Design a protein around this motif. Structure first.
Motif, PDB file in Angstrom:
ATOM      1  N   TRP A   1      27.937  38.845  46.718  1.00  0.00           N
ATOM      2  CA  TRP A   1      28.856  38.172  47.622  1.00  0.00           C
ATOM      3  C   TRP A   1      29.339  36.830  47.087  1.00  0.00           C
ATOM      4  O   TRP A   1      30.138  36.172  47.757  1.00  0.00           O
ATOM      5  CB  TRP A   1      28.226  37.989  49.011  1.00  0.00           C
ATOM      6  CG  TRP A   1      26.836  37.388  49.050  1.00  0.00           C
ATOM      7  CD1 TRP A   1      25.670  38.054  49.248  1.00  0.00           C
ATOM      8  CD2 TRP A   1      26.481  36.004  48.910  1.00  0.00           C
ATOM      9  NE1 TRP A   1      24.618  37.187  49.237  1.00  0.00           N
ATOM     10  CE2 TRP A   1      25.089  35.919  49.035  1.00  0.00           C
ATOM     11  CE3 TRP A   1      27.206  34.834  48.695  1.00  0.00           C
ATOM     12  CZ2 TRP A   1      24.408  34.715  48.946  1.00  0.00           C
ATOM     13  CZ3 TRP A   1      26.528  33.647  48.602  1.00  0.00           C
ATOM     14  CH2 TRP A   1      25.142  33.596  48.722  1.00  0.00           C
ATOM     15  N   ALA A   2      28.877  36.404  45.909  1.00  0.00           N
ATOM     16  CA  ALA A   2      29.363  35.198  45.237  1.00  0.00           C
ATOM     17  C   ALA A   2      29.733  35.567  43.805  1.00  0.00           C
ATOM     18  O   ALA A   2      28.948  35.370  42.878  1.00  0.00           O
ATOM     19  CB  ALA A   2      28.321  34.101  45.287  1.00  0.00           C
TER      20      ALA A   2
ATOM     21  N   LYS B   1      32.342  34.170  42.166  1.00  0.00           N
ATOM     22  CA  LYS B   1      32.694  32.942  41.474  1.00  0.00           C
ATOM     23  C   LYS B   1      31.448  32.222  40.978  1.00  0.00           C
ATOM     24  O   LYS B   1      31.472  31.593  39.912  1.00  0.00           O
ATOM     25  CB  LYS B   1      33.522  32.075  42.416  1.00  0.00           C
ATOM     26  CG  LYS B   1      34.235  30.934  41.786  1.00  0.00           C
ATOM     27  CD  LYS B   1      35.123  30.251  42.794  1.00  0.00           C
ATOM     28  CE  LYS B   1      36.263  31.139  43.238  1.00  0.00           C
ATOM     29  NZ  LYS B   1      37.381  30.321  43.767  1.00  0.00           N
TER      30      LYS B   1
ATOM     31  N   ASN C   1      43.066  40.632  42.777  1.00  0.00           N
ATOM     32  CA  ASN C   1      42.495  39.546  43.558  1.00  0.00           C
ATOM     33  C   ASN C   1      43.292  38.255  43.447  1.00  0.00           C
ATOM     34  O   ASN C   1      42.810  37.209  43.884  1.00  0.00           O
ATOM     35  CB  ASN C   1      41.043  39.293  43.151  1.00  0.00           C
ATOM     36  CG  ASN C   1      40.900  38.870  41.705  1.00  0.00           C
ATOM     37  OD1 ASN C   1      41.856  38.874  40.941  1.00  0.00           O
ATOM     38  ND2 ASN C   1      39.695  38.487  41.331  1.00  0.00           N
TER      39      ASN C   1
ATOM     40  N   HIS D   1      43.529  35.476  46.240  1.00  0.00           N
ATOM     41  CA  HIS D   1      42.443  35.751  47.172  1.00  0.00           C
ATOM     42  C   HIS D   1      41.090  35.292  46.652  1.00  0.00           C
ATOM     43  O   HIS D   1      40.060  35.792  47.105  1.00  0.00           O
ATOM     44  CB  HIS D   1      42.395  37.243  47.497  1.00  0.00           C
ATOM     45  CG  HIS D   1      43.307  37.645  48.606  1.00  0.00           C
ATOM     46  ND1 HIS D   1      42.958  37.524  49.932  1.00  0.00           N
ATOM     47  CD2 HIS D   1      44.561  38.149  48.592  1.00  0.00           C
ATOM     48  CE1 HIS D   1      43.956  37.941  50.687  1.00  0.00           C
ATOM     49  NE2 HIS D   1      44.940  38.326  49.898  1.00  0.00           N
ATOM     50  N   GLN D   2      41.060  34.334  45.734  1.00  0.00           N
ATOM     51  CA  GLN D   2      39.813  33.780  45.217  1.00  0.00           C
ATOM     52  C   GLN D   2      39.449  32.474  45.901  1.00  0.00           C
ATOM     53  O   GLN D   2      38.938  31.545  45.281  1.00  0.00           O
ATOM     54  CB  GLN D   2      39.897  33.605  43.708  1.00  0.00           C
ATOM     55  CG  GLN D   2      40.310  34.865  42.985  1.00  0.00           C
ATOM     56  CD  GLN D   2      40.040  34.801  41.509  1.00  0.00           C
ATOM     57  OE1 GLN D   2      38.892  34.827  41.078  1.00  0.00           O
ATOM     58  NE2 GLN D   2      41.092  34.730  40.721  1.00  0.00           N
ATOM     59  N   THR D   3      39.717  32.389  47.193  1.00  0.00           N
ATOM     60  CA  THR D   3      39.472  31.201  47.985  1.00  0.00           C
ATOM     61  C   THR D   3      38.621  31.600  49.180  1.00  0.00           C
ATOM     62  O   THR D   3      38.674  32.742  49.637  1.00  0.00           O
ATOM     63  CB  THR D   3      40.804  30.591  48.457  1.00  0.00           C
ATOM     64  OG1 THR D   3      41.619  30.298  47.318  1.00  0.00           O
ATOM     65  CG2 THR D   3      40.576  29.302  49.219  1.00  0.00           C
ATOM     66  N   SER D   4      37.819  30.662  49.678  1.00  0.00           N
ATOM     67  CA  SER D   4      37.097  30.860  50.927  1.00  0.00           C
ATOM     68  C   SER D   4      37.816  30.212  52.102  1.00  0.00           C
ATOM     69  O   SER D   4      37.174  29.718  53.031  1.00  0.00           O
ATOM     70  CB  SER D   4      35.673  30.323  50.806  1.00  0.00           C
ATOM     71  OG  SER D   4      35.676  28.922  50.635  1.00  0.00           O
TER      72      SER D   4
ATOM     73  N   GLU E   1      39.810  29.195  55.426  1.00  0.00           N
ATOM     74  CA  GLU E   1      39.689  29.580  56.819  1.00  0.00           C
ATOM     75  C   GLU E   1      40.706  28.777  57.608  1.00  0.00           C
ATOM     76  O   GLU E   1      40.921  27.598  57.325  1.00  0.00           O
ATOM     77  CB  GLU E   1      38.266  29.342  57.333  1.00  0.00           C
ATOM     78  CG  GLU E   1      38.032  29.758  58.760  1.00  0.00           C
ATOM     79  CD  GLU E   1      38.142  31.256  58.951  1.00  0.00           C
ATOM     80  OE1 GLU E   1      37.906  32.003  57.977  1.00  0.00           O
ATOM     81  OE2 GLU E   1      38.468  31.688  60.079  1.00  0.00           O
TER      82      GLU E   1
ATOM     83  N   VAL F   1      41.932  25.558  52.589  1.00  0.00           N
ATOM     84  CA  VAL F   1      40.753  25.395  51.749  1.00  0.00           C
ATOM     85  C   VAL F   1      39.802  24.391  52.379  1.00  0.00           C
ATOM     86  O   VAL F   1      40.220  23.344  52.889  1.00  0.00           O
ATOM     87  CB  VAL F   1      41.177  24.964  50.336  1.00  0.00           C
ATOM     88  CG1 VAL F   1      39.974  24.715  49.451  1.00  0.00           C
ATOM     89  CG2 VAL F   1      42.089  26.001  49.738  1.00  0.00           C
TER      90      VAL F   1
END
Ligand SMILES: [Mg+2]
Ligand SMILES: [Mg+2]
Ligand SMILES: [Mg+2]
Ligand SMILES: [Mg+2]
Ligand SMILES: [Mg+2]
Ligand SMILES: [Mg+2]
Ligand SMILES: [Mg+2]
Ligand SMILES: [Mg+2]
Ligand SMILES: [Mg+2]
Ligand SMILES: [Mg+2]
Ligand SMILES: [Mg+2]
Ligand SMILES: [Mg+2]
Ligand SMILES: [Mg+2]
Ligand SMILES: [Mg+2]
Ligand SMILES: [Mg+2]
Ligand SMILES: [Mg+2]
Ligand SMILES: [Mg+2]
Ligand SMILES: [Mg+2]
Ligand SMILES: [Mg+2]
Ligand SMILES: [Mg+2]
Ligand SMILES: [Mg+2]
Ligand SMILES: [Mg+2]
Ligand SMILES: [Mg+2]
Ligand SMILES: [Mg+2]
Ligand SMILES: [Mg+2]
Ligand SMILES: [Mg+2]
Ligand SMILES: [Mg+2]
Ligand SMILES: [Mg+2]
Ligand SMILES: [Mg+2]
Ligand SMILES: [Mg+2]
Ligand SMILES: [Mg+2]
Ligand SMILES: [Mg+2]
Ligand SMILES: [Mg+2]
Ligand SMILES: [Mg+2]
Ligand SMILES: [Mg+2]
Ligand SMILES: [Zn+2]
Lengths: 71, 50, 86, 52, 119, 100
Positions: C48-49, C51, D4, D7-10, D12, D26
Motif C-alpha cells: 500500500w506504499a 512510493k 498511474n 494519480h501518484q498523490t495522496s 484529499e 495535496v
RNA sequence: AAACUUUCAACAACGGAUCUCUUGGUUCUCGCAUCGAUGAAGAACGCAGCGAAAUGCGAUACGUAAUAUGAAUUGCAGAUAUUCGUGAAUCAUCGAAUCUUUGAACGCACAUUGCGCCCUCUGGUAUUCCGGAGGGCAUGCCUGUUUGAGCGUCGUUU
RNA sequence: UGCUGUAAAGCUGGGUCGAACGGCCUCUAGUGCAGAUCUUGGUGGUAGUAGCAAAUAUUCAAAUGAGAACUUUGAAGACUGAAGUGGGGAAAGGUUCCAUGUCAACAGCAGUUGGACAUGGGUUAGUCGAUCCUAAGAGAUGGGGAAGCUCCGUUUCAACGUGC
RNA sequence: GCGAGAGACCGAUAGCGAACAAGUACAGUGAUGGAAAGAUGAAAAGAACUUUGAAAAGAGAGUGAAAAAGUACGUGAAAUUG
RNA sequence: UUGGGCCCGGCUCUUGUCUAUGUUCCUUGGAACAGGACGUCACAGAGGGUGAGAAUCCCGUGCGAUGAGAUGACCCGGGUCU
C-alpha cells in the motif's frame, strides 16, 4: 599550535580518528625517535583527531619541529 | 548540548563541512551549470533533525 | 493552552537515528524503526506504499556489487587473466 | 499515457467551508506543492480526461 | 607517473616492503610541505605509488597461496571461484551426468537414428 | 437503465477487467519468431524430417463420426502388424500411443 | 485653463505567454536470464594539488592491477610525467585486487565508537598485569569424528 | 495599412524577429473557453493606507566613517535591585563561540553595528561525566502457541560452568 | 532485471513526481508527504580603457551579424505601470 | 543393434580491424550546410556532427572480408587412442 611548540615543549599533530594514546606514543617514538611525557587527544569540530604530545625534558620540541620541517 | 554522543558529533562535523560556498574555479569549467551551492543551511533557519 | 503554550514543552525525542537506515525513525522506548522495521530481520515494506518502495530500493544506493554482475555474466563469469596479444 | 500518471498523490478534498473549490488537494506542509489541487483533468499535474 | 609495475614484479618481499617504507616517509614529508606550498601535485604520484606497491605485494602473496593449495580438495573460499551463489549451488558436470544403469542400457539400446524419407 | 426496444445485453464488465486486458500487439512478432524457431529446428536435424509420422483416427461423437483426422500415435498392435517395436519406432520418426 | 480621471498609439517597464527547439518522458515490439553468509540490497562516515553537490571510489579511497588502444588532460597549476614508445588519457575493456563503520549481519552489546574470551608474535624486569599487530569465538539443520549419559538394554564374573 | 466573408475567419502594408512553414485532396484526434467559491503562474485597486504605541529614558561631546538618533569611547541621567535584566547548568540547538574583514540580502526605521555575510582559529582529564549497577520495566534462550508476520514466558516440565 | 529497435505518442503548467546537484530542497515525533526549476551567442569575443560617483552603478568607448542578444540574457503577448 | 576419452573444424554468442563519390565556380551571408552552374558515387540518398536545409567535409550507412576470445554429457563432420 606553535605557541605550544615554543612555550610548552608540545608537538601538535593530526592523528587518525581510530588511534588511542598508546598507539600515538609508540608512533611518535618510531617516526621521530622522541619520548612523549604525555599524549592529550581531542576530536575537533571538523571530525579529525588532534594530539598534544608533550615530550620529556630530554627532547626539545622546537628542535624536533625544525627537524620535521614545519618551523 | 555539551554532552553529546560520538555519532551525533560525527553528524555535526559532516553538517559543518557541507555548509560551504561554491569554490569559484568550478564556474570556469566548460559546460558548467552550477552557479552557487543550492544546499546551504543556517542553524536558526533549518534544523538538522538529528 | 493546547496550542502555542503546549508546543513549548517539546524537548524529548521519541525517535533517534536508526542503525540500519539512518533515518531518525528508531523509536527509543519501543526499540524499533518505524521506517525499516529494525531490528527485525526483514525490511519493513508494504504494497500500500509503492512510493515508499521507490524511495529505498535497488538503485537508490551504490549497488557496489550488483553493478558488475551483468558485465561478468556477459563474459560467462570468466576465471583467469587476459592474455597479451603477440 | 502511463496508467498511474496524475494519480501518484495522496490528495484529499478539503470539503466545503474553507472558501476554496472542492477539488482534492495535496496534504502535508513545507513544500509549495502542499495544498495544491490534484487528480483533476483541469488541474496542473493531474491526469488527462479519458487517458488513452 | 611513478613506479613501473613490471619492475615491481621482479622484486622480493623485502625489497618491496623497503620501498613501501620509503614511499610512506616521502608522503609524510610531502604532507609537511603541503603546509606551506600549499598546492603540491606530487602527492598524487606518491599515493598511487603506494597503491601499486601494496597491490603487487598482495598479488605476489596470493599466487604463493594458490600454488600452495593447487590440487587440494579444500582451498580458501577467497581462492575459490566467485560466480553466483546459485551457480555454486548448481550440480557439477559429473553429478548432472550421473545416470542409472537402466537408463544407460536403454540409451545405448535405442539411440536416435539418422534417416531420411522419399527413397 | 432499461429503455427502448433493444436486445437485453450480458456485458460482463463489473470486475476490475481493465487489469486483465491482453492485446496481441505481438502477433506478427510471434509469427516471425515462430518461423525462425521452426527453421532452426529443421536445419539442426536435416535431412531428418521434423515431424513424426502420425496415425489416422476417427473423430469421436455423433457429430464428427464422418470426419477422420491425425491421431496421436500408432497402436502397439499396428506396429506389431508391421514388425516394429515401439522403442525402435520412436527413434525412426514414428509416434507410438500405448493408450489407443 | 491646469492638475486629475478615462481611452488610444509610440517608446520604456512589469511579467513570462506565444513561436521554434529537446542527451527527457510515454507506449509498442524483439532478444536474453545474471543478487546474497565467497557477506547482498540498503545505510553512515570518509577519499581529489586546489570541491560544496551530483557522479565515482574505500585508509591501495574521483581509485590499484591487467587487456586493449595510441597522445592527451584542461578551470588553473605541476612533475623526481610522457611521444618511431612496456606509452598521455580512457567506469575503452575488465578475468587480478583493495573494499572503512555497518546492514540477513555472526563473540556479547549498541540512544555506548561499551565489554569480553581463545591462539601466535611483539614492547614493558611477566604463563597470570599493562600495551600493540595478526588470526578466531552467532544460531537452526545435515553427514561424519571424538568424548560421553541412561539397570533402555545384550554378553561374562562373584 | 487595408481588402474579402452574414459569420466562424482568411489575406495583406509597416514595425519587431531569427529557422522553419504553408495552400489544396484526404486521414486522424488529448481539436476551439468567460464563467465551474475551476487549476497553476502572474498582476492590480485598496494604498504610500491600516499600521510600526506593553516591559520608566535618554542626553552632551569626541573618535570612526562618503554618510551617525541607532557603532565605539568618555561624561552624565536611569533601571534590573540577589525569587535579578547577575553568575552557572539539565533538555534542545550545533559553531550561533573568538579574531579579522565586511554590508547585496536579513536585523518590519537605519546601520560604519550584528547570533547576518566571508576567511581563518578554537573544545587537552587515571581523579568531571559517560562507561558499570540495578529500579519501574524491556527482552533473548529452553520450551509451548500460531497458516504465518510472530505471540507467551524469564528459569519457566532444560543434561544450561566458553566454571573457579 | 539486462540489452536493443521503433511510433499518425507528449513537447517543459505537456510527457514519469523528476528533461536540471529529483525522490532533490523542504515539512512532519512518526508512518509518510514532496515541489519549483530547460533556451546569450557560431564563438565569451562575458565589455580593455577614460570619466562622474563612497559604492552599486551611470556616461563615453569596446566585442559582436545583432547588445532591439549583457548572464536580472532567444522571441518577449496580456493583465498592470511610467 | 552397440562403449568411452582428446584434436581440428562447422554452427551459436561476444568482440577487434578494414571500405565509394566535390568541399570545383558565381551570388547572398558573420558562417554555405542556401540559391544557381558543372559534376561524381550509389548493394551507401538511414541517422548524427560541423558557424543556416550537407548522399558526395567528418562519423557513420551499404557491401562484405578477415582476426581474437568463449561456449555446448545432453549439435554434426572429420581425425586419433582405447
Ligand atoms: Mg578527552
Ligand atoms: Mg526555532
Ligand atoms: Mg516517549
Ligand atoms: Mg500529468
Ligand atoms: Mg513551447
Ligand atoms: Mg522514444
Ligand atoms: Mg546506556
Ligand atoms: Mg538560430
Ligand atoms: Mg503539405
Ligand atoms: Mg480537451
Ligand atoms: Mg480564462
Ligand atoms: Mg460559458
Ligand atoms: Mg477564480
Ligand atoms: Mg490564484
Ligand atoms: Mg498612518
Ligand atoms: Mg497597535
Ligand atoms: Mg531601582
Ligand atoms: Mg524582591
Ligand atoms: Mg542561566
Ligand atoms: Mg560574536
Ligand atoms: Mg530595516
Ligand atoms: Mg538599509
Ligand atoms: Mg554565519
Ligand atoms: Mg568520577
Ligand atoms: Mg524486574
Ligand atoms: Mg518475548
Ligand atoms: Mg525458541
Ligand atoms: Mg513536469
Ligand atoms: Mg511536476
Ligand atoms: Mg527563456
Ligand atoms: Mg536580432
Ligand atoms: Mg536577440
Ligand atoms: Mg529578451
Ligand atoms: Mg499592456
Ligand atoms: Mg544543421
Ligand atoms: Zn531504520
Amino acid at each position: 599550535a606553535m605557541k605550544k611548540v615554543e612555550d610548552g615543549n608540545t608537538l601538535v599533530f593530526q592523528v587518525d580518528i581510530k588511534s588511542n594514546k598508546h598507539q600515538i606514543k609508540s608512533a611518535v617514538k618510531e617516526l621521530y625517535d622522541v619520548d612523549a611525557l604525555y599524549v592529550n587527544t581531542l576530536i575537533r569540530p571538523n571530525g579529525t583527531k588532534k594530539a598534544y604530545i608533550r615530550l620529556t625534558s630530554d627532547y626539545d620540541a622546537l628542535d624536533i619541529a625544525n627537524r620535521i620541517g614545519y618551523i | 548540548p555539551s554532552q553529546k554522543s560520538f555519532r551525533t558529533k560525527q553528524k555535526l562535523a559532516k553538517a559543518q563541512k557541507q555548509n560551504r560556498p561554491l569554490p569559484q574555479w568550478i564556474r570556469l569549467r566548460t559546460d558548467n551549470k552550477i552557479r552557487y551551492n543550492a544546499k546551504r543551511r543556517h542553524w536558526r533557519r533549518t534544523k538538522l533533525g538529528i | 493552552g493546547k496550542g502555542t503554550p503546549s508546543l513549548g514543552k517539546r524537548h524529548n525525542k521519541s525517535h533517534t537515528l536508526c542503525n540500519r537506515c539512518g533515518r531518525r525513525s528508531f523509536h527509543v522506548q519501543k526499540k524499533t524503526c518505524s521506517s525499516c522495521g529494525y531490528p527485525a530481520a526483514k525490511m519493513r515494506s508494504h504494497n500500500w506504499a509503492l512510493k515508499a518502495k521507490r524511495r529505498r530500493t535497488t538503485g537508490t544506493g551504490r549497488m557496489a556489487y550488483l553493478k558488475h554482475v551483468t558485465r561478468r555474466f556477459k563474459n560467462g563469469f570468466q576465471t583467469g587473466v587476459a592474455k597479451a596479444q603477440t | 499515457v502511463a496508467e498511474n500518471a496524475g494519480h501518484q498523490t495522496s490528495a484529499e478534498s478539503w470539503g466545503t467551508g474553507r472558501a476554496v473549490a472542492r477539488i482534492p488537494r495535496v496534504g502535508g506542509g513545507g513544500t509549495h506543492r502542499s495544498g495544491q489541487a490534484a487528480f483533476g483533468n483541469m488541474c496542473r499535474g493531474g491526469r488527462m480526461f479519458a487517458p488513452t | 607517473a611513478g613506479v613501473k609495475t613490471f619492475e615491481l614484479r621482479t622484486k622480493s618481499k623485502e625489497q618491496l616492503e623497503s620501498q613501501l617504507v620509503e614511499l610512506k616517509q616521502e608522503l609524510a614529508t610531502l604532507k609537511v610541505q603541503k603546509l606551506q606550498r600549499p598546492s603540491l601535485p606530487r602527492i598524487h604520484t606518491v599515493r598511487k605509488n603506494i597503491a601499486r606497491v601494496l597491490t603487487v605485494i598482495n598479488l605476489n602473496q596470493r599466487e604463493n597461496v594458490r600454488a600452495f593449495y593447487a590440487g587440494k580438495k579444500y582451498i580458501p573460499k577467497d581462492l575459490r571461484a566467485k560466480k553466483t551463489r546459485a551457480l555454486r549451488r548448481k550440480l557439477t558436470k559429473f553429478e548432472a551426468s550421473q545416470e542409472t544403469e537402466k537408463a544407460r542400457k536403454q540409451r545405448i539400446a535405442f539411440p536416435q537414428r539418422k534417416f531420411a524419407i522419399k527413397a | 437503465a432499461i429503455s427502448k426496444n433493444l436486445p437485453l445485453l450480458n456485458n460482463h464488465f463489473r470486475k476490475h477487467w481493465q487489469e486483465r486486458v491482453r492485446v496481441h500487439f505481438d502477433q506478427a512478432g510471434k509469427k516471425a519468431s515462430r518461423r525462425q524457431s521452426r527453421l532452426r529446428k529443421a536445419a539442426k536435424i536435416a535431412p531428418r524430417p521434423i515431424d513424426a509420422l502420425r496415425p489416422v483416427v476417427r473423430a469421436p461423437t455423433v457429430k464428427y463420426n464422418r470426419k477422420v483426422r491425425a491421431g496421436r500415435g500408432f497402436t502397439l498392435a499396428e506396429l506389431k502388424a508391421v514388425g516394429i517395436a515401439p522403442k525402435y519406432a520412436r527413434t525412426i520418426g514414428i509416434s507410438v500411443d500405448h493408450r489407443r
